[PDB]
Design a protein around this ligand. Sequence first.
Ligand SMILES: Cc1ncc(COP(=O)(O)O)c(CN)c1O
Ligand SMILES: Cc1ncc(COP(=O)(O)O)c(CN)c1O
Ligand SMILES: Cc1ncc(COP(=O)(O)O)c(CN)c1O
Ligand SMILES: Cc1ncc(COP(=O)(O)O)c(CN)c1O
Ligand SMILES: Cc1ncc(COP(=O)(O)O)c(CN)c1O
Ligand SMILES: Cc1ncc(COP(=O)(O)O)c(CN)c1O
Lengths: 305, 301, 294, 297, 300, 297
Amino acid sequence: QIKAGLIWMNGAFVPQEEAKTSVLSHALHYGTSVFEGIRAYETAKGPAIFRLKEHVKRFYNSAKVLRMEIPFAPEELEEAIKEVVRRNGYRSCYIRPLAWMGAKALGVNPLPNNPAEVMVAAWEWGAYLGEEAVRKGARLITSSWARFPANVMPGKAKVGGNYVNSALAKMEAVAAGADEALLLDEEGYVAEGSGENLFFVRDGVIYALEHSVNLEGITRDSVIRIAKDLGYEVQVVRATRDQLYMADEVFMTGTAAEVTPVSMIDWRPIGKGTAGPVALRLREVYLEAVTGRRPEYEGWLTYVN
Amino acid sequence: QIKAGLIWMNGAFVPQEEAKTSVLSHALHYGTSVFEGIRAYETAKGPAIFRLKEHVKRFYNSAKVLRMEIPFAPEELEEAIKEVVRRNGYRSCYIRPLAWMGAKALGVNPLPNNPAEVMVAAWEWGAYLVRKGARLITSSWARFPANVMPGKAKVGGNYVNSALAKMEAVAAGADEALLLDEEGYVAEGSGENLFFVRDGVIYALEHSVNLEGITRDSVIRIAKDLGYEVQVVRATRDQLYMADEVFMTGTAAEVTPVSMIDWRPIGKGTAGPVALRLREVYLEAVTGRRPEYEGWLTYVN
Amino acid sequence: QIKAGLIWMNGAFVPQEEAKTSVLSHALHYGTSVFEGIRAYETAKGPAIFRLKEHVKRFYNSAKVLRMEIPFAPEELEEAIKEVVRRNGYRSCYIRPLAWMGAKALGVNPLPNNPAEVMVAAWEWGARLITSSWARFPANVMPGKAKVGGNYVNSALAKMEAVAAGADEALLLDEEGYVAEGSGENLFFVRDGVIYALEHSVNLEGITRDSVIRIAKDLGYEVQVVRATRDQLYMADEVFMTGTAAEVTPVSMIDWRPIGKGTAGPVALRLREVYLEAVTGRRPEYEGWLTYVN
Amino acid sequence: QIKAGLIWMNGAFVPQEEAKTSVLSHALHYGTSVFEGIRAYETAKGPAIFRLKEHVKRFYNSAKVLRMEIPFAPEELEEAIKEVVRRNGYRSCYIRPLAWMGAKALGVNPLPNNPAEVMVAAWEWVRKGARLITSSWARFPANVMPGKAKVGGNYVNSALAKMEAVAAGADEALLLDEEGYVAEGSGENLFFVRDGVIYALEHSVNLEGITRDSVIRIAKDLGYEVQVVRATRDQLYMADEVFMTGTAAEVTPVSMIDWRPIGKGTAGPVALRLREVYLEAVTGRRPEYEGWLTYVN
Amino acid sequence: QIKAGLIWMNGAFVPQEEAKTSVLSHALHYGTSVFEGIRAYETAKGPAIFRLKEHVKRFYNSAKVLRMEIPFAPEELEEAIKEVVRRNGYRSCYIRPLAWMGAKALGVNPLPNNPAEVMVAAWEWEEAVRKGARLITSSWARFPANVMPGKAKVGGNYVNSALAKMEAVAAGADEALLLDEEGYVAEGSGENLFFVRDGVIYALEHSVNLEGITRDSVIRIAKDLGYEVQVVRATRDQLYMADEVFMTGTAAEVTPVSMIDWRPIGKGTAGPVALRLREVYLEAVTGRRPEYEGWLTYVN
Amino acid sequence: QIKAGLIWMNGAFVPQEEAKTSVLSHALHYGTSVFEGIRAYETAKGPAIFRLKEHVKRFYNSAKVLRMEIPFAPEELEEAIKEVVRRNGYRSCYIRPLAWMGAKALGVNPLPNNPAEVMVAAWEWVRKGARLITSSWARFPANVMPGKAKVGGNYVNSALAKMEAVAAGADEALLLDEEGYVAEGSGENLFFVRDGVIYALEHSVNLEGITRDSVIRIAKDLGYEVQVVRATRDQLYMADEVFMTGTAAEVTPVSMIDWRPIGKGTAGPVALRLREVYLEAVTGRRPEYEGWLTYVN
Ligand SMILES: Cc1ncc(COP(=O)(O)O)c(CN)c1O
Ligand SMILES: Cc1ncc(COP(=O)(O)O)c(CN)c1O
Ligand SMILES: Cc1ncc(COP(=O)(O)O)c(CN)c1O
Ligand SMILES: Cc1ncc(COP(=O)(O)O)c(CN)c1O
Ligand SMILES: Cc1ncc(COP(=O)(O)O)c(CN)c1O
Ligand SMILES: Cc1ncc(COP(=O)(O)O)c(CN)c1O
């Protein structure tokens, strides 16, 4: 079970046991929900939520794609997100805002079901004080499931239904013995991980992948800024699986994945076969940023206390 | 609201108000659910469920695609479906079985969440039992490629594509959307399979990336039994534009004649004789008026 | 120049010199026209138009794709087509009906230009192919089941390429890489005695193709309809094309690779000959396909 | 009817009623024509044609795609374009040069019909923003129709999309390419703005717009960062602004796409600034952009 | 090592040790070779080669795709194939004819290298079959029909098969299932696919696949047994929900598939239809089906 | 026949006649080999191999794609490459390293055949412009064949396209990708020039050419603006210039594509200048590029 505790349900917090919805809810049958993934890190000044406004903006943007009406002002949701951290006494945690179409009707068209129901839940996130797993690097395997074309599913939004594609790819990767799946688009180019954006390094240059059919990662954005600030040249390109195979380094970014070095893809070692110095350095600075240790990046933090 | 009444929840019936699940359920966040759409029609011998076993088979088949484990034997689900009709005193009704990944965890991988939670609900539908024909508009959303979303399964997440297409069609002033596949060929409606008639021949569309409709299957058998020649082909939007007739099939749509597509009239511009004839025989079959099709019916009483 | 003679222009015949339209015509700028290709053959009973009905039906069907309004009843167009033959004293000829959007306005939307203008003109009447670098348009890009003027830019580009390469005709593939059709004809191939007609895919539903399939079945051949690749053609015993102008044309070579014996084969030659017998009124079984002008 | 007046026909002006061509013309049957869209604006120094050079160059470039021979030197066509304005006493007008394959033969191969016939005609010529709807017709792949040229046949695709959009209640159609990415409008190039950055769509299968080119230069001169990218429909849905560019459309803000409001739901500040500088430029009020104008007087 | 023994090299048999070619051979650098896979089975009347004629015809057909010239008449190659079995005293064996572009030049264009060099080599060939093979869908798509000639057994084509096979084995499967670029099922790395649903046998369309001779044989057998056979395009999930799935190929014969992507097919073991087809096929190749004797070429 | 002379075979040089491999070698049946193309040019200080390290790095990179094991360290292969030039007394020559899967087994899976066998052989080694024709064979998608590697099997696609081009009367083939965009020549990368700007094509499904890389650096050093873009066939048709790059092709101007003249119809100034400066670089006349040269003496 998930230890969420107090959950914000359409305007008010209620015990986890009361945070339930009808099994006739539109989103439970047709994937018509939108959600976010936000992290709060402990800092010398207490818990700090990372790039809250950017995540809330994307939350409302995802809703717009489904023509879903969120009956709350962004300001209200932001306060609820801060409150879910405070009320539960969390420090390092994962926050999951969710807006879903309710049970007014079950016609596939979700418009009659507006406005959407909304909830905000959060749970503890274990801090990583080790290093072996990160330095060993993650092992990826290219999926047999292609990332949806931009006119099939809205890849720039975090729409519930979209994740069936991610789920299928993730299960496949894990079954094959890998840590994560690397999905290609229908044309055969690299797209993204089941829940992470991809980067690679070659001859001193950092290559971020184009947005193509992927989600515009906030971690990706953060990493690009950090890289440029450190003096690295950053280029945005479309990439093939074999460009990754021969890269000096490959790494993934995501709210949950932070900055994760990738040491092997399809059983082919990447560079030295372990995490490289560039990815490790970016992860290092990124973590200093999210924990309030970099004054230049304080603007990205929202302290709950 | 939906007047479902008593809902079967993981082995037992409970009042609708109690049929709820955690908002932390995997399926509410990632579209990891599977469902079915089954009709029961009132007959002279009481309510009869149409092709129950075929629908239950597809339900379990959909679960397999997601590697979802349904903790009930097909026979148990069939009994539950018969009971949801009986216990609520329904005659004609729509039955909605649903299996979804619960709130054990929220990692995108659904395996840790097995087994799936299951429920069966039903509500009165088709209380009253077209000539103008439905108006369709081709969608700007393409039906998903076979390696993107499992189109042969009724997986919850798949319907985001159907939802986007349906909203677009309705907004454009049409009754339903006609989706093309990524290559540009006709696929299916947001929730119906397509057929067209030309020079006396009935053309059913290949399965391609569509759901293998049970109504489509029924219509093909009925057509052949009536003496019509039936061919299965891949089709383009303009093959439909010049067809003598076009019609859709689905559990909810039954057999629906299509009189216009993209503001271009199909044939006479109204429902044609072939679609109307197939519809009539189909309706006679589901209401227990055709001895030759009794095998497709499951009488609840 | 083209020796057309008397041309039917929106209801009446006029000298060729008078059969003109404004250079501001929508169709001259945006390819918004539809047309047909119909043949008349000389028979023992005079000129006979081949499958006039199917061609006229397709003409109106093409117009519908463009939401183009033809201000004449099919029966009227059919009479005009018979008249262009006899008024010009033609026996064996090619007939070209054309409907185009006029010069009422030049916004890309052709609806304000309806109804379309119409005219009917006519004039007295193995192959080596090369696969084109131009793909036949996807079914959601251009209406391949219609003979819309703009569609033929794709055909023109392919034909020029083929001729420039030293071939007689171009073989176009669809965007996915499968064989589609020639720049103006449908394709068939023969393997181990079985005749394979290509599925309609993004191609025009040929009337000659339809005729050839019926004749082939009547002659006792097994006919299957399939999707084909260029190498299935390379390895075929025979390959042939069909079209109103091309009739049944054997294909002896594709991409400099000989097909079978490298010369016209028996099946294609036989189908071509029986087809000619049908269009010239020598086969009673196909009399229904002919419309005698006299 | 179109009030064109005097039309330049293969070397000489003639009354509109005399500007006709055989119905057996190759282009009327197979879409084998090329054309341009050019505008003249009123200025304090008389009518000024906008970027005449670039339009004429593209006209000949389009002809090359069809291996069409234009029997006139670009300099001659330029003079004809200026004369069609003068002779008709136009000030603010739209100019439409057209080269088409004639009636020498009707085989699909246009080569035997060369050289092409040519004519030049012309006729006298926001806050709410335009509403677009994504089309069910995909923009042609680069190996299906020559999208970098204004070939007549190409516009059947544009016509189908425009009719669909209008029928759906929109002002213009937004076409995606076959892969599902945004391509262009039926006759306009697309841009979107997000967090202060202007995103111009890559050329992909689209026409290389001269208005698009002008807007990018203007944007950079105003200090805006401009990135050229591939875009999806939902990147547009989430943009702060979206706008279209074209000779006829000038710079047109887009307030809604697929019934989803863009940003505030009305024309945005960036699109409006670009539109204003563009209009100041074409009317001879920006010294730095005078090079783009050709004064007829 | 491969125990081939005497190998036919451009018209004459030589010891395996002498069967070598220049490392500057065009085919070793650009994949410009064509080959076949043929089997001989022991029968009561001695070794019998299965559908030799069809295999040789495809060999020459593959060469035509590359505009490769084979400097021997089909009849000569057929005799060489019978002899490779005889001379080596083989009974049950796998035969591998190969035509490749030599070392006359290394420009990518192979025409200057004609005619091709040719050689023919061969080598000796219940619970597992009943258990069924396990497949995993590959992340490598079978090449489009305008990218590589899928109807021919061109050497270079197999880089795609090799990549897919390695991936499947690495994933713990027996074989790879490749989809085409559009997402539909194509074929295995070296075999054609079929599935069975509600008593009907579904053979996959040729699409971008090789026109298998085993596939052809199985369809004829199936029809002779009275099964309805439909040729269709198929998706991975149509296979997931099929009652049975099986592969065909010269080496694979008729191999039931009990699992795909860790999802059991039907009962999770070999099904009855695939097993019947396999039984009749094996009876046929071993000379125990008079009606199919036309498919056999007895070496003695 | 090829006059290679002494060939390095798995650690030792042997006469050409002895450089043979079993006809049962996996690579001869399934295209499982990887190779490189390297050139040495005569300079004032003897033979100089151009960008040896980048070529060797790519050689090992190609091997990794096939999970092929090369039983020699890069330094050993580099020494062998220098020796193949020295031992044969070559000045200007083409060097061809090749690694292939041997005859241990013939199952399609090549892993059981590791490690690969390796050999290095070498042999002695515009104004009008090359004529290209667009191929009917598309360059393989990135998930069909590894286009960033020089894998033997990949070249069946190149071979088919080259034969087609030559048969059509052209010098080289221009392949498009499956989506219809320009990809690369059968063995060369493409560039085009328009309005003073040099456009290099994105990597897409193409090989990351070392000559392409060299030309881009040289162009920028000379003061040219260089942009990297996705291109269509008609963007090339309308370009002022088009040129190809490759180890064998060096910098080759393209004067015509699909019978449509590019610009003036003959080699243009930009391509000619880049070709000349490239030749100066590879022959040791530009100190700024000395780092790219490896002198064998
Ligand atoms: C599909 C997808 N892609 C990428 C990401 C990474 O985005 P972000 O950096 O904003 O969390 C996510 C979130 N895990 C995702 O769901
Ligand atoms: C996507 C889809 N396609 C087709 C259908 C029709 O299938 P059936 O006849 O089995 O209800 C449905 C059900 N409404 C559907 O959801
Ligand atoms: C593109 C196209 N395809 C096929 C055909 C053949 O059709 P039909 O047999 O009806 O003339 C034509 C007519 N030449 C055509 O224009
Ligand atoms: C297809 C297309 N795309 C874009 C444009 C805009 O190009 P320009 O700015 O050069 O007029 C046009 C012209 N209306 C066009 O026809
Ligand atoms: C790619 C491929 N597909 C299918 C097959 C099966 O063909 P056959 O039945 O003729 O051996 C083969 C041969 N193993 C093959 O190489
Ligand atoms: C497919 C391909 N593309 C491009 C090139 C050019 O690469 P480079 O400049 O590294 O020789 C080559 C080598 N001839 C090649 O084989």
